[PDB]
Amino acid sequence: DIISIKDIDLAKKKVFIRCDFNVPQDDFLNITDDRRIRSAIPTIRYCLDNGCSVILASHLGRPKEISSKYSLEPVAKRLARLLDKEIVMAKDVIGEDAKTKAMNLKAGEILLLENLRFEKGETKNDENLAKELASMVQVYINDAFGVCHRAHSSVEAITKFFDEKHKGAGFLLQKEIDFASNLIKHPARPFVAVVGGSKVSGKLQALTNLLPKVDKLIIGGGMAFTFLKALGYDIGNSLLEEELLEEANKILTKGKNLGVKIYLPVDVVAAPACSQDVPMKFVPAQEIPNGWMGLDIGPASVRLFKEVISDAQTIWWNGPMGVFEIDKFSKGSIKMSHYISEGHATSVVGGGDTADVVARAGDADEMTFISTGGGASLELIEGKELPGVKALRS
Ligand SMILES: [K+]
Ligand SMILES: [K+]
Hints:
Elements: E1 14-18, H1 35-49, E2 53-57, H2 73-83, E3 87-89, H3 96-104, E4 110-112, H4 127-135, E5 139-142, E6 167-169, H5 171-183, E7 191-195, H6 200-210, E8 216-219, H7 224-230, H8 245-257, E9 261-263, E10 267-271, E11 281-284, E12 293-297, H9 299-309, E13 314-318, H10 331-342, E14 346-350, H11 352-360, E15 369-370, H12 374-381, H13 387-390
Parallel strand pairs: 1-2, 1-5, 2-4, 3-4, 5-6, 7-8, 7-13, 8-9, 13-14, 14-15
Antiparallel strand pairs: 10-11, 10-12
Helix pairs in contact: 1-2, 5-12, 7-8, 9-10, 10-11
Protein name: Phosphoglycerate kinase
Subunit structure: Monomer.
Family: Belongs to the phosphoglycerate kinase family.
């Protein structure tokens, strides 16, 4: 149903590619993870190989207003090394400099527009922005699954300025869609969802839609403590969403009614504060000391979870098992990455935090697929129609 880049005649044309270059940066604005730039390359190279000129556009962060801090200039440098091709940068998005550069662009050249979100209309699906972006090119390609869950100009309104023979989905967008969709369709079984992170409300809708689909569900991260609390466990000073206690109980009740095997941590790494520099204890989940907090799954839980996933043919994992940015509270996530990656399941990772764990674990290459689109994969797993994808439906 979705129009593919493969069914569009784009040879020798001028092509707008909406890419996802929303990469992490450090305080000196050096790029600390270029995976999204790398994932964009096959679509870009396919156009260049077909004699196109290429206008690339992406957002970076969420600028409130224009500043050098959110410039795409470091993305341009990094992409130039990775493609071994030179890049022209526009000083603006649809101002005079972009339009002139776009018009001057020769076959085989690459133009990177400045941050899309320097235009206030982008996150409002402004139709004038869309029209101005569209005027620069003959073909529209979306390769940015990561923003497709939002009605933004560069993925939604812009598509109204191209007919079905001049717009389509890039190779990355198609993969993101195929991997996410499989999971809510007919995945190989046993199908295990492994869910984590610190908030239940983050995952509630995904869990509700996955529940009738999965064979087993492991719940870790800070969000587990709301489930344990919903079951009457004392959780000391751990994270709690009081207001979601009843919803968590509903997940467990329906899970059981549907025959889903649901596992929560049976032990945790507990500490008096969330820092490297305080003491830590391995304790049962029923015995977090007064005033202490659970910050990672414990070794018994790691081991149980290993056994839970051991016969899996499909695993979806979104969310760390614990506060993995702190070394002392990272081991449960790291070992889960090891166990998931080393097993024989089709393994699909979601969430930037989870991609980060998998990177630190050194396992990125043994995962079947790591989504580089944060909330977008989740909203698909939730059962929603994504406006960016809909926009490209034949
Ligand atoms: K046009
Ligand atoms: K594997």
